[PDB]
Amino acid sequence: DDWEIPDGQITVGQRIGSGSFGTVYKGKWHGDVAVKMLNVTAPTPQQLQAFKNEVGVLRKTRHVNILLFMGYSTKPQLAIVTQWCEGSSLYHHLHASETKFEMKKLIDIARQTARGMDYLHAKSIIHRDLKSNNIFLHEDNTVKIGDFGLATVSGSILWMAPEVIRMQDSNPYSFQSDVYAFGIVLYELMTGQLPYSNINNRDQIIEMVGRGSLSPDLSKVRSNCPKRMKRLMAECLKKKRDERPSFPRILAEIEELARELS
Amino acid sequence: DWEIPDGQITVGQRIGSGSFGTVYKGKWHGDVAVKMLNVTAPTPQQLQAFKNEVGVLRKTRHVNILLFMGYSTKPQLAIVTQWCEGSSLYHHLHASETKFEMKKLIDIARQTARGMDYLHAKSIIHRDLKSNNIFLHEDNTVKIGDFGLATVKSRWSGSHQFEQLSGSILWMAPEVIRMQDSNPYSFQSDVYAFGIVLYELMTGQLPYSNINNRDQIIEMVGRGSLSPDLSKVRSNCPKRMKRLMAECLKKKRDERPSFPRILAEIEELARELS
Numbered sequence: 200d201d202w203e204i205p206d207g208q209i210t211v212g213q214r215i216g217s218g219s220f221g222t223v224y225k226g227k228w229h230g231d232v233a234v235k236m237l238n239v240t241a242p243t244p245q246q247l248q249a250f251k252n253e254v255g256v257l258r259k260t261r262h263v264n265i266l267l268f269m270g271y272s273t274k275p276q277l278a279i280v281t282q283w284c285e286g287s288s289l290y291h292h293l294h295a296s297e298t299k300f301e302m303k304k305l306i307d308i309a310r311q312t313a314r315g316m317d318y319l320h321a322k323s324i325i326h327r328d329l330k331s332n333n334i335f336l337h338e339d340n341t342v343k344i345g346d347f348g349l350a351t352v353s354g355s356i357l358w359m360a361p362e363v364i365r366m367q368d369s370n371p372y373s374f375q376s377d378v379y380a381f382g383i384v385l386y387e388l389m390t391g392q393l394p395y396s397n398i399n400n401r402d403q404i405i406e407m408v409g410r411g412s413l414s415p416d417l418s419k420v421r422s423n424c425p426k427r428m429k430r431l432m433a434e435c436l437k438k439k440r441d442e443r444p445s446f447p448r449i450l451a452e453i454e455e456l457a458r459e460l461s
Numbered sequence: 462d463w464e465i466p467d468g469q470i471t472v473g474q475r476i477g478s479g480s481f482g483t484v485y486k487g488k489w490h491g492d493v494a495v496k497m498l499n500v501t502a503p504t505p506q507q508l509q510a511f512k513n514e515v516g517v518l519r520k521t522r523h524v525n526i527l528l529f530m531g532y533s534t535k536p537q538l539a540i541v542t543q544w545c546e547g548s549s550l551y552h553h554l555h556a557s558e559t560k561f562e563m564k565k566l567i568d569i570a571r572q573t574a575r576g577m578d579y580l581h582a583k584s585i586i587h588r589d590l591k592s593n594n595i596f597l598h599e600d601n602t603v604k605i606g607d608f609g610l611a612t613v614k615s616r617w618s619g620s621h622q623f624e625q626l627s628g629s630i631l632w633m634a635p636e637v638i639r640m641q642d643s644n645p646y647s648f649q650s651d652v653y654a655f656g657i658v659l660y661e662l663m664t665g666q667l668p669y670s671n672i673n674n675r676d677q678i679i680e681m682v683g684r685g686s687l688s689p690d691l692s693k694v695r696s697n698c699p700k701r702m703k704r705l706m707a708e709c710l711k712k713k714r715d716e717r718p719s720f721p722r723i724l725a726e727i728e729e730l731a732r733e734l735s
């Protein structure tokens with residue numbers, strides 16, 4: 200089949216912000232869409248490769264908790280077209296609005312995020328930038344994982360595993376670094392706070408997290424955080440990469456502990 | 462690319478069986494639905510039905526179309542899609558006495574029109590649009606599916622069709638009822654079915670509620686002597702929907718509007734109501 204959308208069909212609307220490359224707009228194409236466009240005369244080879252990589256990855260995904268890819272265009276500009284997400288990111292809800300979710304809902308958000316991540320890893324896709332700003336709460340209820348960059352909101356230091364934040368080597372990312380980022384998301388859900396909220400300097404966070412002398416303060420977890428969720432968070436946040444669990448185990452554990460409440 | 466290896470899906474509760482095969486709830490990176498088409502070695506018919514359904518579904522990526530997720534071929538031919546949670550529009554309107562506000566009735570029409578506009582843009586004729594194939598997922602997003610697609614298909618254009626397709630008679634365009642072409646289905650017959658959905662939304666009733674048997678409906682819709690009673694729309698029915706419904710139900714198929722136009726009209730109404 201083919202996902203190329205002919206020029207002229209999409210009506211490009213309000214500008215939302217910068218994406219992971221290019222600029223994101225709300226658009227119309229058989230309903231609402233998002234359109235991420237590279238607004239340049241001619242793309243560099245690097246820009247073309249980034250576009251191709253993103254289309255290549257997105258076209259491999261069909262899951263309710265992954266942003267729905269819908270098509271692309273290459274002329275007159277490189278564009279990636281996806282569903283429109285209605286609502287706000289998890290970051291916005293937790294930290295900006297400080298939305299007060301019930302524990303059942305917090306655990307369901309964790310569950311849905313774990314399903315999306317389990318799916319990506321099953322498809323051999325590393326996210327590399329999981330964080331609450333990249334977890335969209337569509338229609339205030341269905342998690343959509345994306346890589347929205349600035350459209351939703353250095354901006355990712357708090358979710359970086361120690362091996363990533365240490366800049367250990369030229370590509371320190373793995374499924375296990377995604378797991379660590381998911382541990383930080385669990386921290387955000389279960390505490391309603393960002394980690395290191397009282398550390399005022401980013402360089403200090405970089406040095407101390409990387410050395411293992413700073414880690415998230417698990418005393419901040421809400422009093423009705425289930426013990427099994429606290430333990431799972433601690434496993435996801437293990438400082439040594441190879442000690443962290445895989446997503447199939449994470450997901451199974453969340454599904455179990457969710458049943459136990461309900 | 463979309464083949465799911467055997468062993469990965471945990472096939473759970475059986476939800477329903479019929480001419481479509483058997484649908485189960487399952488687990489595979491979260492909830493899924495799994496439709497199995499055979500139990501023993503598949504016939505060539507079953508295999509071609511499977512291939513066609515995967516081929517149609519893999520052309521679709523739209524929020525208002527049931528999300529295809531994958532397939533398996535052993536030990537059973539299986540089509541894997543998202544799980545839908547909730548009830549169909551038919552169940553709401555006709556089995557549950559759900560009372561939707563007008564803004565919500567129009568949003569249902571709007572999301573249905575988006576999905577149908579999309580299918581038609583992809584050159585896909587649905588062939589069985591009706592309120593029971595409009596799923597109100599999490600009561601907030603419409604998912605159009607074909608939740609009763611029969612695997613075995615008759616070769617004979619005639620009168621035993623209407624027994625098996627008894628669940629769809631109310632949504633069949635007159636030229637579909639008459640079967641004067643070997644395949645009388647078109648984009649325009651999908652539009653007619655959408656007209657009947659609009660009727661359901663704006664009246665809260667099925668068409669032909671006082672006609673007491675299907676044979677009479679087949680005969681009279683085919684002859685042009687029975688039409689839905691458009692006067693029965695509820696007092697809050699927008700004027701735009703009265704006109705639009707009548708246009709979708711036009712007897713001459715080429716006089717019905719296309720989905721781009723239908724969608725644009727409903728989007729304008731939704732703005733006016735908001």
Ligand SMILES: CC(C)(C#N)c1cccc(C(=O)Nc2ccc(F)c(C(=O)c3c[nH]c4ncc(Cl)cc34)c2F)c1
Pocket residue numbers: 215218219223224232233234235253256257260265266279280281282283284285324325326344345346347348350351
């Ligand atoms: C598969 C994976 C690894 C994940 N996960 C991945 C890899 C690379 C990129 C993306 C990725 O998500 N791309 C992407 C493309 C086009 C867009 F418009 C947007 C985009 O900002 C939006 C798409 N709907 C939206 N509704 C609302 C708002 Cl405010 C923004 C958007 C977008 F983020 C995802």
Ligand SMILES: CC(C)(C#N)c1cccc(C(=O)Nc2ccc(F)c(C(=O)c3c[nH]c4ncc(Cl)cc34)c2F)c1
Pocket residue numbers: 476484494495496514517518521526527540541542543544545546585586587605606607608609610
């Ligand atoms: C694109 C088009 C023309 C449309 N529109 C079309 C053509 C042919 C077939 C289908 C089609 O939809 N197939 C299909 C395949 C697998 C399934 F499990 C189910 C299925 O009953 C369900 C899929 N989730 C479900 N949640 C809950 C419940 Cl109760 C049932 C299901 C299913 F209906 C759709």
Ligand SMILES: [Br-]
Pocket residue numbers: 258519
């Ligand atoms: Br695809």
Ligand SMILES: [Br-]
Pocket residue numbers: 673674675676
């Ligand atoms: Br009857």
Ligand SMILES: [Br-]
Pocket residue numbers: 627630675
């Ligand atoms: Br009937």
